Amino acid sequence: KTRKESYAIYVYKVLKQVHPDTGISSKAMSIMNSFVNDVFERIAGEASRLAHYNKRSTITSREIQTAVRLLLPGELAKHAVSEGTKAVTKYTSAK
Amino acid sequence: RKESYAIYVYKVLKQVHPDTGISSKAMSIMNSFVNDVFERIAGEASRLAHYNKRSTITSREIQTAVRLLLPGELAKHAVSEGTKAVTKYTSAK
Amino acid sequence: AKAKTRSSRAGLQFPVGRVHRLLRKGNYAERVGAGAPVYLAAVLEYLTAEILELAGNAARDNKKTRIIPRHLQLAVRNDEELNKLLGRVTIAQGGVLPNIQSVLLPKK
Amino acid sequence: AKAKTRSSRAGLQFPVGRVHRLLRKGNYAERVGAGAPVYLAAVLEYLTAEILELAGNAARDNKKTRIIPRHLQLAVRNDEELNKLLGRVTIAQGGVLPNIQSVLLP
Amino acid sequence: GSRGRLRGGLGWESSLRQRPMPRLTFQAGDPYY
Amino acid sequence: DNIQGITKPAIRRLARRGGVKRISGLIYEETRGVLKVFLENVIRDAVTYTEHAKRKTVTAMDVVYALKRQGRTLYGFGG
Amino acid sequence: VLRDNIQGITKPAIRRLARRGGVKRISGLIYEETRGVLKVFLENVIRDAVTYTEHAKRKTVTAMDVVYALKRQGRTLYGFGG
Amino acid sequence: RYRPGTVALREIRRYQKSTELLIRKLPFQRLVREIAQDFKTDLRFQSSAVMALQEASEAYLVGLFEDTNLCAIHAKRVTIMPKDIQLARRIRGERA
Amino acid sequence: TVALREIRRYQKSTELLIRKLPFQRLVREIAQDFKTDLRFQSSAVMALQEASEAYLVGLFEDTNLCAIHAKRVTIMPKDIQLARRIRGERA
DNA sequence: TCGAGAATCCCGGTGCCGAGGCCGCTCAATTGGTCGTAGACAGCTCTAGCACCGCTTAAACGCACGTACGGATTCTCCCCCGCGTTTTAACCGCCAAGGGGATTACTCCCTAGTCTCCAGGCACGTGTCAGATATATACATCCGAT
DNA sequence: ATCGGATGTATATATCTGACACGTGCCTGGAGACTAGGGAGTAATCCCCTTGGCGGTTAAAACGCGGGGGAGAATCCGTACGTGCGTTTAAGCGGTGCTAGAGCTGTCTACGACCAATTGAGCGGCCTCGGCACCGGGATTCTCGA
Known part of the structure; x- marks a missing residue:
């Protein structure tokens, strides 16, 4: 009986956005949780190495963008860059 | 100023082969090898420390990382060398 | 006070604050900017939406209304780029794609 | 007086203070112990000595008194432990090992 | 453009790629004589 | 024994899932050897990880x- | 500005590369395959290198x-720094 | 009586459609325990640990058999032989 | 005979086997296709060459193994494609 | 080409157990304000990357000849597949004991920070000798004629 | 199996040059000495989940038999590749000149760490109903001998 966190509720929100009449089992959600953790770690590690190569001490959106370009294959990378840029632009104009 | 492991490699070379020199390209190769192994071992030790929810890297993490990375007899001999160094270091001061 | 989440400002579904905390505690750099968690959360949400859309199509093809790991394997392995991203990853209880070499199959 | 290095107490040639600095500044963990740089430096020096004496033997069999990258390649690729450790590493100006498959020989 | 049809006021149609590439399989001993 | 519990029909089924049509008679010993090598390689690291945590x-x-750490990431048991 | 430079990788050079690999007899179709494979490899590495360069402005x-x-791709190279 | 090779194709399709585990659980568990006996004596295993080991082993063997099949077909045969496994493991990067 | 002599001669040495200037031109062309108005250090082109010859030599060794498996002495494109598929570069 | 017949697909009925909501409630994320330094930016210098010209000579290219290797065909025999019988051990339900894994509260000692000081390890010069190249010679090796 | 004998290989010595190895400043990074606080070792307790046993069922494994088709050899044909020679081309070396642009230094602000107060988002526990599994009967569909 100790708090342990996971990405379940957010994955379910996205799923209701994409397919409004579909469910998911427990093991599939476990797979999805592991997938999100793995990708997060890859991107963050690449950004860390990028910052250390260029002698910086800050991880910015620029580092994440370059790491996303390095990691994902072509068309996925293009669309992911579009999504991230759109989100940052929308966030920085809102209070 | 740019630092490297050149003089230490030269000292070890004079230890094992008293009458042998080394060219500059081979010294660059050796420097790259030392840096590569350093990064590998330190990263594995960091992962071990993060798995068990600790905040310190001790000689025990380094020993386990060495046993995970190096194959076969190299792991055994390296463990012996490192243990000897640590006990000698704690003996003096 | 607590007025508005950051994910509501960015128009996302993933947690910006949790991603910021995870970045700040993971030993990645000395300091972490303000737009890094937003950008990262947007990317993660995009990838999740892609996989879930393909898997939902695969599940609907089989007269089912609930996704199981077999549908995830079918979705991932039938796409060039996703199969390249997960090329060294095993999905438990997933099986394989049906394929038989053409030489083995009888002709006419 | 009062200037004995940490490597001198450990009985090593590789530098312990420098390795401690690199561990501290490399963002590996929040804290670093006391025997970790010592133990790491000892392991690194051991590996260096191993590879260097193999390379020196390769150099004397070629009747040369200097070590060139070809000698390092020949030393590494002939030993199975080092060939496992460095299995996915390219050494510049090293060439290959002279091997011809037996079905090709006359 | 018919992949995903909801994301807030927008949809998931303009975001997801519309023509993903199918994965091609290597065939040995091509029966092409 | 205990490597003879990997019976011939089981290896035959594993070959069928991989798309094989005809199996030579000497395949089963090779498969048992390969499986044992793989298992030793993984279990050594698992026991090392166990012993580190006391x-x-x-x-x-x-x-x-x-x-x-051997480049064989597995999804499903990670949580 | 530049074109058909892939034909600057001549047939004798490919023969020499095959000989260092231990190949005793070579077909006549190997040269086109080798040019295609080399072009793909170079594209991948150069794309990564230019990304790294352009990050540093x-x-x-x-x-x-x-x-x-x-x-990054598992082709670690010794002798040029690093 | 079906002609030789037909039931083989039926079994190929059937086992490529399903997702279950093909090795008996209890003999695999005994083999894992005996192998682990060498590295450290008197060990204990969570059940999910043994299940994870089984999943990894099945996946590895199936992929190896796919590469073996390609090697066998390349030599103008349909029967797989130990030397195909050896070539696949050597090129894949494991024999040497 | 001369083939075996060439094998021994080129396996004993360590020089590069492709002329430098055509390789430099090809590298510049591809980088042009990625980004315009780029410059290169000479050691960058030298590193690219070293890696490329290493890759091609290892690939030819795998191809030779594949050809010998099929009871031939001539290497063919099918052998290269099989080796690249089993290596995991293709699928 | 065509019917036995064996395997596969579709419809309807029954039940159970896990996915999806609901509800407390704590603890992590949000607000608001302070402070110190990490990058952004501007200017300056000087290195090294790019362009051109000339000459030489070794590598690339085209062509001819012939042989040896890849492929196709045919024959034999043996070993792997399909199927029926008999044996065995895996799976399942139930029960029972206890060894370690979690969790909590205490205590101390090992590791950041902070000054101060001094010596080790980079840059910069400089000399000499190992290795490359030339030149001529001796010995293995491979191919043809027996 | 045994000789010419022509070719390519491993044998000296001469000379010459540039790279390696060592010697001198100096300056900045590491060692000495000391203080403060929290991370981690340690004892104690709870209880969960791992190991072990027993009896019955029945599905899987093991064994034998017959036959066919696939691996392997042996033979023959022709065409693509290797070898060698003469002709054409472009790489490589040496030198000259000209800027882009990398690399460094000095200022200054805007941006992120940090701390205290506040509160709602997300997690654990409890229920319930419907999606999926299983079973039985009936039309389709695919093999295969004749």
């Missing part, structure tokens, strides 16, 4: 980490 | 960019 029980996460 | 590609690009 435990006497091998958990799922030791297996997951041992597989991950 | 430079205009010349350095040796460290190539070294990092090779390291």
Whole structure:
């Protein structure tokens, strides 16, 4: 009986956005949780190495963008860059 | 100023082969090898420390990382060398 | 006070604050900017939406209304780029794609 | 007086203070112990000595008194432990090992 | 453009790629004589 | 024994899932040898991870980490 | 500005590369395959190197960019720094 | 009586459609325990640990058999032999 | 005979086997296709060459193994494609 | 080409157990304000990357000849597949004991920070000798004629 | 199996040059000495989940038999590749000149760490109903001998 966190509720929100009449089992959600953790770690590690190569001490959106370009294959990378840029632009104009 | 492991490699070379020199390209190769192994071992030790929810890297993490990375007899001999160094270091001061 | 989440400002579904905390505690750099968690959360949400859309199509093809790991394997392995991203990853209880070499199959 | 290095107490040639600095500044963990740089430096020096004496033997069999990258390649690729450790590493100006498959020989 | 049809006021149609590439399989001993 | 519990019909089924049509008679010994080598390689790392944590029980996460460090990431047991 | 430079990788050079690999007899179709394979490999590595260069807001590609690009893909190279 | 090779194709399709585990659980568990006996004596295993090991082993063997099949077909045969496994493991990067 | 002599001669040495200037031109062309108005350090082109010859030599060794498996002495494109598929570069 | 017949697909009925909501409630994320330094930016210098010209000579290219290797065909025999019988051990339900894994509260000692000081390890010069190249010679090796 | 004998290989010595190895400043990074606080070792307790046993069922494994088709050899044909020679081309070396642009230094602000107060988002526990599994009967569909 100790708090342990996971990405379940957010994955379910996205799923209701994409397919409004579909469910998911427990093991599939476990797979999805592991997938999100793995990708997060890859991107963050690449950004860390990028910052250390260029002698910086800050991880910015620029580092994440370059790491996303390095990691994902072509068309996925293009669309992911579009999504991230759109989100940052929308966030920085809102209070 | 740019630092490297050149003089230490030269000292070890004079230890094992008293009458042998080394060219500059081979010294660059050796420097790259030392840096590569350093990064590998330190990263594995960091992962071990993060798995068990600790905040310190001790000689025990380094020993386990060495046993995970190096194959076969190299792991055994390296463990012996490192243990000897640590006990000698704690003996003096 | 607590007025508005950051994910509501960015128009996302993933947690910006949790991603910021995870970045700040993971030993990645000395300091972490303000737009890094937003950008990262947007990317993660995009990838999740892609996989879930393909898997939902695969599940609907089989007269089912609930996704199981077999549908995830079918979705991932039938796409060039996703199969390249997960090329060294095993999905438990997933099986394989049906394929038989053409030489083995009888002709006419 | 009062200037004995940490490597001198450990009985090593590789530098312990420098390795401690690199561990501290490399963002590996929040804290670093006391025997970790010592133990790491000892392991690194051991590996260096191993590879260097193999390379020196390769150099004397070629009747040369200097070590060139070809000698390092020949030393590494002939030993199975080092060939496992460095299995996915390219050494510049090293060439290959002279091997011809037996079905090709006359 | 018919992949995903909801994301807030927008949809998931303009975001997801519309023509993903199918994965091609290597065939040995091509029966092409 | 205990490597003879990997019976011939089981190896035959594993070959069928991989798309094989005809199996020579000497395949089963090779398969048993390969499987034993793979298992030793993984279990050594799992036990190393166990001993570092001062435990006497091998958990799922030791297996997951041992597989991950050999480039064989596995999804499903990670939580 | 430049074109058909892939034909600058001549047939004798491919023969020499095959000989260092231990090949005793070569077909006549190997040369086109080798050119295609080399072009693909070069495209991947150069794309990574240019990404690394353009992150640092430079205009010349350095040796460290190539070294990092090779390291990222599992082709670690010794002898040019790193 | 079906002609030789037909039931083989039926079994190929059937086992490529399903997702279950093909090795008996209890003998695999005994084999894992005996192998682990060498590295450290008197060990204990969580059940999910043994299940994870089984999943990894099945996946590895199936992929190896796919590469073996390609090697066998390349030599103008349909029967797989130990030397195909050896070539696949050597090129894949494991024999040497 | 001369083939075996060439094998021994080129396996004993360590020089590069492709002329430098055509390789430099090809590298510049591809980088042009990625980004315009780029410059290169000379050691960058040298590193690219070293890696490329290493890759091609290892690939030819795998191809030779594949050809010998099929009871031939001539290497063919099918052998290269099989080796690249088993290596995991293709699928 | 065509019917036995064996395997596969579709419809309807029954039940159970896990996915999806609901509800407390704590603890992590949000607000608001302070402070110190990490990058952004501007200017300056000087290195090294790019362009051109000339000459030489070794590598690339085209062509001819012939042989040896890849492929196709045919024959034999043996070993792997399909199927029926008999044996065995895996799976399942139930029960029972206890060894370690979690969790908590205490205590101390090992590791950041902070000054101060001094010596080790980079840059910069400089000399000499190992290795490359030339030149001529001796010995293995491979191919043809027996 | 045994000779010419022509070719390519491993044998000296001469000379010459540039790279390696060592010697001198100096300056900045590491060692000495000391203080403060929290991370980690340690004992104690709870209880969960791992190991072990027993009896019955029945599905899987093991064994034998017959036959066919696939691996392997042996033979023959022709065409693509290797070897060698003469002709054409472009790489490589040496030198000259000209800027882009990398690399460094000095200022200054805007941006992120940090701390205290506040509160709602997300997690654990409890229920319930419907999606999926299983079973039985009936039309389709695919093999295969004749």
